[model samples]
Structures are given as C-alpha cells and as structure tokens.
Target chain A: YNVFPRTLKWSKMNLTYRIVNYTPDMTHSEVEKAFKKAFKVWSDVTPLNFTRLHDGIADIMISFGIKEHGDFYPFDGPSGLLAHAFPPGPNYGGDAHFDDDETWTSSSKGYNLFLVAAHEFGHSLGLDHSKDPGALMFPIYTYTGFMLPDDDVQGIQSLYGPGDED
Target chain B: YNVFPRTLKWSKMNLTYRIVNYTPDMTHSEVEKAFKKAFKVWSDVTPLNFTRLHDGIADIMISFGIKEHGDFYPFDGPSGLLAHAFPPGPNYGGDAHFDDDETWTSSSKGYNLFLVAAHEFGHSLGLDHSKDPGALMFPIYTYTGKSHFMLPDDDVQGIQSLYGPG
Candidate 1:
C-alpha cells in the first residue's frame, strides 16, 4: 500500500551500514565491497557521499529474508518479493532486506543483490521509485545485465539536487 | 541526497505497527489502537488487505528507541533522525522504528507516530520514500503535520500491482 512521507528535511549526516550476514558467497568484506559498489553506483552519479564504517552497529544493517520476520508484511517464499528497506533509523534502519527464498547472485542468473541493493539503497537514501520504465525506479526488474541508465540519473538528481551537500 | 530510482516497486503486504512507548500517558492497547487507526488510513485507501496476528511475531515490529536494543540500528539521544525500519526480510524483516528522543503523539505536536509509522511502513513493504511531496514515500518530516496518512493512488496501485488483490 501507500506510506505517508515525512516532512523533515535532510540532516546532512553520513549514513552508515554493516553486513550482519556473512554467507559463503557474501563475506563481510565481500558484502561490504558489493554494498559499497552499490552505494557507489548512486554516490558516483550524485554529489552524495557515503562513509563506510567498520566498528559498532552501523546506521543501517543489511540482511536477507525468507518468511515472516518482524514487521507485519511476510515474505511469500522467494520469487515474489526481492528485497525491501526501512525508511531510516536504528537497527535495520536504512537497512535493506532480500528474500533468501530466491537464489541471490552477483551475476545475471539469479536476483542480483547489487542491482536490488542499489535499488534498495535508493530507498535508504530517501527515494521512491519513478514511474518511467527506462528509469531505475521502474517497478519490475529488467535484465539489463548490470547497467545504469540516463533516466535513473535524472531521477536521482531530482531528489538530492545536483552536487554534494558537503 | 538523491538515490537511484532505477529499481522501484511496491512491497507485497500491508505492514501495521503499534507504539508501546514506556510512558504512563500511552498504554499498550492505546498504542495498538493508534497503530490500527494509522494502518486503517492506508488499507482503507488501497484494495490491499492487512491481517493482524496476536501470538506469533508480526512480519513487522514497531518500537521506540533505547540504547543498544538488540538489532543493529540503535537510538541516538534525540532529534535529527526520528525513526527507522528493516527492509522486507530474513530476520527482523518488516520492522518499523521511532526515535525515543522526541515526544511521540497522535497529534501534530511532536513526530506523529501515525505519520512516521506510515513512512516506515512504506519501507517495510518493498516501497521506498517518494521524492514527490504529495507522495507518502517522501523522506523528510514535516512539523505542520502530515496532510494525511492515506495511501496515495500511486502507492495503492503500486502494491496491488505487485502482490495482486489481498
């Protein structure tokens, strides 16, 4: 359904995250690397900068999911929901969730965490999906084979505005 | 500040939350009522259906901030960051958060639980914050009070299209 947006403006602080799930394929550094890559996808395109942290609970926590966890919404096995993110705040705040039911991969065969994480990361940064199919905000996943589009750039610029806040 | 909208979609289910602050002013059921009312604002607007369970942990969980409260994101002493939520899921999926720093209320005085809950719930579902001020997905908080927590037309269609009718 629809969630109401908050009226508070940007606080201009460095949002951080940690990888609680260090799986076989996704190790701490590996997850961090991939996550950084995903974060970079947006940071590079925009002036926004994310400072990667190593100690303490991160501002955001990233993990995977299968069925019911905590929130009211339950994951339907795997194929249905890919991943989701909380608005912003502690403990999974700005955190991203992926459906473990699906075979998540760094490649094209399964759901790409990079792609999905990048998308979820967008949400973490306080962005909603755009209606344009050509844009990254498009609802469905496209087999673009790991690529960023111009429409996506336009949409991001629209939110953060052009350039770094610092 | 701007995040990529390259991938945007609706979370399949409606996530609901109740605020059980450790306050004499608010009771558990009172918190429950406030949340139910907040949730109703959305479910009523969309064709989406929300089921509330009593025993098992909800797919999502909502609570106020405390120092080092189990999960990753911990509450900071007050203002600035209001609340947070976990993405869809693996563990602690679908959870919504609120900062204990501010005075939570059903009215416009402090950060409205209904509004903040609605925002975090958006993230609890697969949806992210909207750039459009009119859209519930917007990231910032407003002191004037959220116009309405109702699921906007875009959000209703977004979730329904993703999960199908309740």
Candidate 2:
C-alpha cells in the first residue's frame, strides 16, 4: 500500500484584502477617503488592482484584538506588535491583524493606519523587506512615514507591473 | 506645615515584548521582515519612529505567542486574533504577539505578514478604529481579494499632522 507523508505545501501567488471598519475618531466618509488615497499608492504603481467589498468572504480579513481571541497569536497587552498577517492563500488567507491596545487614531500620537496598512498589503502581494532603511519593507517601525523607495517600487513593478482596470 | 499631593512627576514610557519561539516555519529575519513592513505602512505618514532594541529597558519589544503567554490578554489557538500590539508608554507598552496555532507563511498560503503588522502598529502609535470601511482603521477583518493596502487619506493627514515631519 502506498501512503502520502504529511508535508507542508508551498506556492507562488498574488493576493488581495479589504478594510472593514475605521477609527472612532474619524467618520465613515473620512475613512473611505483615506482608504482611496492609500490604495492609490500601490495601484498607481503595480498592475495589482484593489476592489472594496461590502459583503461575502474575500481574500483577507482585517480586524483588531486585545488578547488570545483565536488562532495561536495573542495580544501582549499594548504596544508590542503593531500588527501581523498571513503569507498568502485562498480561504482563511491574507488576514490582517491590529492591536486594539493602542489608541489607533486617525491623527498622530499613535501609529498611522494608512502607512501601516499599506505595508501590510505589500506582504499580501508577496513582497518582502528591503535592507534599505528608506525602503517600505525596512525591519523597524516609523511613525507617519512612507515611501515606496526606488528598490520597493522596482521590486513591486517587477512582480505585478502597473495597475489594471476593472 | 501640611504637605499637598504632588502632581508633577517625571515618567519615561517603556514597551516590553518577547518572540514566542514556537513556530519553526519562519526564521528571525522573516519575522523581522514582516514587522518592518508593518511599521513602514504607518511610518510613511507620521513622525513616529521605531527604535529596534533588546527587550530589557527598551521602549518597545517584539514577541509571538499561542496561548496565555502572560498579561491580561491570552491567545485562542488558531482562527481568530492573529496578533496584537500595545500603546507607547513604559513596560508592557508597544509590544506585539502572534498566534502559534495558525500556520504562518511568507507567501500567500496562510496569512500575509505585512497586513496584520500594520494593524498592530496602529495601536502602538495610539490610534483607534473608524466606522468607514475604506479606512485601514476599520474595526473588523475584511480579507477581500483586492490589491490596495494602507491607511486612508484622512488617516495619513491626521497622523502626519500630529507627529509632524520625521
């Protein structure tokens, strides 16, 4: 009899995501406006296109938490990990997480959602960090600062190219 | 002479964290990459800067987990609360957590690394959720198959306004 051994599977791919809620400090329109602006940052450069959905399951799920709500990852009270996301896949894939422990304001005095979310999206699309500090994929956190950096822009364009129309 | 309660007190905020070395799937650099991407999302628009340092006496520390690591919040296996971060202050502030139960990936098979990290960073910087779906500060998880990721315009303008230029 032949049997299959338990092994991990890997594949190369592109992914997508959507935002569900906005900060309390800002209104829905304000949030939407912010989202559009951030989205353009990537769409304008890469062939990847983003579409906002109001219903049904999408590629990624974005949300917040305090502590072990589900999954293996847990919240460390406050101000530890800004957020995290899965590598990439179809179902239960491309989910994004944020720490509810922080103030999470639309304004400063905390981490900026637009900048962070864009970075997370980069992961969703299969991009990794660049050694350059100016690169968006640097290994540290910077408040209210963002730039695709020449390397990042080139890296993304190499993979997906410019944005596409729906 | 009667002494009055002192209101003036000097305080320096410190953030603590530890990496939950449970998953053999990701290397330290991979994990670090995800974190850097997450921080980049926010840093692009705000003046806040992340200083990577050891957990001892640092403003912020990074870590991962599955169940009750320690603190008010706990992990919930796999399926919910991918990870979390804290606000900036002192010990226990600006930390991050990850679910050990969930299969983490650098690719698009499980979750996107950059997406969730951005969310946690949102909390670290001191922001809250918004009602608008377009905003990265949105309250719930929406893993749609879209391209764009990052904070909305309102969020960017707000954070930069607060933190000012880096």
Candidate 3:
C-alpha cells in the first residue's frame, strides 16, 4: 500500500493502451493476448478499465525497442533490463518498452511476456515494485503460474479502491 | 530474495567499483564517503567487498549523468528517476547512474545520495527492489534521515542468498 518515492497515479480509472509495435518472438495475436491479460490483472482488481487500441495514441504506449529507442532510455541488448515503463503522466508516462533482445514467449521456457507485461503495466498504472514475492509488481521476473497475489490486490485496491463488483 | 529474470550476478564476492564521475552538489569527499558507506551497507551483510578506483574501469562503474549521458536512457527531468543501475554483468552491467538532474545531498534535504546509492548498488549487485518498505532495496524512495542506514532483513536475506553472508 506504499506510493512510489515519486508517487504518481492515473487520474482516470478507465484507460486505453495501444501496442505501438510487436516482437517477432511471438505471434501478433499472442502478443496482444499477453498484454490484454496482463492489463486484466490490474483492471480486475481496481475500477481501472483498459481498452486495446488499433491505431490512435493511448494512455499506455506499448512497444519493443532495442539499444537506443526514441526515448532517452534504451534497452541494453539482453538480460540486464528486460523492460521499463513510465508512471501515469503526460507524453512518456504510461508508456511501456520491452527489450527486443530477449526471447519473449507465452510459456515459462523463455521470458514470459504475460508475466513481464503484467509487472510493467503495474508501473504504468503508478505502482512501483512490490516486496511481496508473490506480487505481480515485484521487480524481478519469475514465472509463478500467473496468480494475482492478495498483497497486489491490496496494493491496487488501496490506490483505486474496489471497483463496482464488476 | 528474488533474482531478476536473467538470474545474473557478479561471479565473485570481492568487487571493485569506480566513481566514473562526481555529482556537482556534493564534494568529492562527500560523494566518496556516501558511496563507501552505501557499499558497506551491502558488504556488511554479504561477502561483497568494494574498492574504489581513481581511474581504471571497475566491476561496477558509478557515475551521475543527465539526459543523453552516453547510455540509451538519460535523466528524465527531476522529481522522479532519481537513479538506475544495471544488474551484475559485464560492460554496462553492474553500472549505476545517478540522475544528474537531481540535487543530490548528504543530508535529509535533497535526495540523500547515501540511501539512493545504497539502493542502486543493490541493483549493481544483482538485487532488485523489495516489498519491505524498510529495505534499502525498496523501489520507492522513503528518506528516513538515514543517519545509520541498516539493510533490513529482506535485503539481508536477499543479498545473503545471492553472495552468502559476511
């Protein structure tokens, strides 16, 4: 239930995220499915609503960039930093970037896009890394069968409150 | 006690760190003392040993850089992104960059360089943020005066698991 040192939250609960680009590691539909489910991890708990965009700009811009992306921050080839996102704000805020270097996959054999996306979106929604090992927001990426832990539920609920039983 | 997805860490315990550059706000001695103590925060709990270099490259190279400071990611602005560090590895790995845009200080005033350094160094040593807010590795920066910054149990256990206890 802690806010980031630089605490930030999206003003509106309902938000849209667009996949600006995709990685060849997974099929386009798999990428879309991974993110949709990732967003669901948060929307399911909070009143937050996330919609997919086909073209227009979105609150959260999703892309896979390597080395030097458009932003000041770029991906460093492989393992070091898998992905990073901005907290809710204007421009870059709410944007998520993945390293094209990793072998992204839908299964635990490689880095799980679902797991990583779920965690990055947490940052995009103004949540920082969580300490609970079970938390989806925990900084380190581990494949734990994709169960939303209660600690994360409490953290998100504390921010947006329990949504209208939807 | 979570490891990043890549599960990378400094292969050795005794490590050398070089202050790539200095932050203008703090005196050379201030920055030195801050980093020395910060690294000690981990060495106190783990078998890690940090020796500073006046010039040569190090296992962990520390610096303060603003936007476009040679890496893909640069300092965003000011309020947030106080710093970022790479996980343990070669080249850019095990490196730390303080947001030169920040007014780094040794006291409770601006962001305490000691605490931030300690936290970033946690990453340099292959550790990620923790759920325990009291931990030095906690992602959210909560400056607690930090007269005597002690690595909390979560941090201790995490680092100890990685490199064994001092």
Candidate 4:
C-alpha cells in the first residue's frame, strides 16, 4: 500500500462530489449510480462519506474529456491511460476524470466505468497507487470484479481507519 | 508557446529517438534526413539533443501507419489528422506516428514530411498545439518551405522554456 506524498488526506469525513460531465455511452442516471457505487467502495473501508451534488463546486468533481482538458494532465487519445484523478485537497484536487475517447460501459463489453471510477476515487480520497497487482489501486488497469481487494481496504484503512466498529 | 502541463519536458538534455518505420512516399534516406532536420529544429532552440538509434529502444519512437495501428488512437486516412505524438514519459510516450495515407511530399505541395514531423516532435517534447499559427506547434498544417526552415519566435520560446535555450 502506497500513499501519494503520504500526507495528502481529506480533512473532513463527509465530502461532497459532483459529476462535471458524463460519458456519451451511459446515461446520467447510470453514470450517477456507477460513481455512487465506486464511492461506497472506499467509504466501506474508511471513515469517509461521499455526497453527490448536481450543480456548483463540490469537494470531488467528476468529468470526461479528450486530449486537452483544462487541467495540467491531458487525456491520451485512447487505451494508454484509462483515467486520472487528483489526490485529496482543494480546487483541482479530489477530481476524477475519465478519457471520453475510450468506450466506457456498464457491462463487460468495454472499459468498465464502475471499476475505473472506483480506482480513481481511491486517488480522490488520497490513496496513491499500490504495488500489489491484486489491489484495485494497482497502476495497471484490470478486471478484478466489483469489490475492493484486501490490499486496497488495508491501504485506505491506514489513512482513515475501518468504517465498521469492533 | 503553448505546452502540455508546461513542466512535461525530457529531463535529460541528450535524448535518443528511433525510426520504427518509414512512409512509402519518401525514400529511407529522405525520411532519415527529414527527421534528423526536424529534431535539429527543436534542438536549435533548447539544450536538448536528439540521437537516432537503429536498434533497441529509444526515448522517442517514430513510425507511420494508415489506420488502426498498435496504439488505440488509429490514424484516419487522408485529410484528417496528419500525425500524432505522445508527451514525454515511458513506453509509448514521446512516440510519433504519421498517417501514411496522405501523399506526404518533400516540397511545399502535399503535406510536407519535415514540417509534419517537426510539429509531432513538438508534442513528443511536450508542446501542445499553439493558438499562434506562425508557431510550428500550431494545430493547423500550413505548407511552410522546407528550404528556409525557421521556427516562429513562439515556437522557440516554447521549447526554450521547458529545457532552456540551446
């Protein structure tokens, strides 16, 4: 388990989120659900609460873009990198962005939006990439199913501890 | 003088590049000379130096493809994207691929190889398309004479900002 700089973590437990944009392949309703579920993955293992907002600035903003987004990190055309998210903080921080060029899907057909969102949200919550391939936080994207892997749980727990009480 | 993320420049002054393949329009010698000149154009403005390699890996891998090449962003045939390149990083990064479907010319007629390459290498070195049409990094492809090859001040300032003046 690795943390980006090891010191970047959200100061507040209840964090608000907003979908700045959406993938053309999926509906807003479905996209909303996908992110909601992804957020739950981290919230399940840590003392974090994610709230989604429709308009205005939120703690974490989700968006889709092509080569030149307003951010410093632009999306490669396709393949290469699936998406990137900023570590927890302010402004650009806690933002998750997926490459709109890639075919995002809810099913197993293309790159699973649900799965990718879960990983980016991990970064949104201050988790860096994990060396363990089994973990969702692994640098390479893979189909490891829905739930957060053990290493991912342990990593997030280290940041904010377990959500479940003993 | 637009740059992608600004700070995304090759760390070392001495960089290596390799021609993975050549376009059918131009001879191997012409293609070699074209690319060498293209690399020199940017090197003239920055402290960076580019050396071509015949075998093994290189920092920037140059190639040509018609459509659906190795990378996800395939080359669409004539009249679309002339070529594309990844920003500085590893693996596919700094790689430039030209679409061979276009009748790439040696002179100021059909898309000139030297001009196209110089532009792509700008992306390879981390400069994004500039709004300044006079700049070599500009997105539009205009037929600038190869005989009198010179970069607009914007292009020179752009590359120099990343690696310092040569």
Identify the runs in model 1 with alpha carbons over 4 angstroms from their true place. A1-10, A23-30, A89-92, A164-166, B1-166
Number of the top-ranking candidate, with DockQ as the measure:
1
User: Per-residue CA lDDT of candidate 4, range A1-166, in tens?
Assistant: 1001225677679999999888899998889888899999888777788887989999998899999887667788977877999876546778888999999988787888889999888888777888886888888777645767888888787777897754
A38-143: candidate 2 lDDT, tens digit per residue: 6667777865556677656666667666687555678787688777765443344466777777666556667776777677665655556667777666757677
Q: Which stretches of candidate 4 lie over 4 Å from their true place?
A: A1-166, B1-7
Return whichever of 1 and 4 wins on TM-score: 4
Off by over 4 Å in 2: A1-16, A22-25, A144-147, A163-166, B1-166
Q: Model 4, B48-67: lDDT tens per residue? A: 88898999999999999888
Q: Can you rank all candidates by TM-score, best first?
A: 4, 3, 1, 2
Q: Could you give candidate 1's per-residue lDDT for residues A42-153 as a string of tens digits?
A: 7776777787665677766777767886654568884888788875543444777777777766667777667778888877766667677676666677655656677777
The digit string of per-residue lDDT tens for model 2 on B45-87 reads: 6545554554445555566676787754677887887877655
* Native contacts present in each candidate (fraction): 0.14, 0.00, 0.01, 0.00
lDDT, residue A104, candidate 1:
67
User: Which consecutive 10 residues in model 3 chain B have the weakest lDDT in total?
Assistant: B1-10
Model 1 CA lDDT for position A15: 63
Q: Say what the interface RMSD of candidate 3 is.
A: 12.5
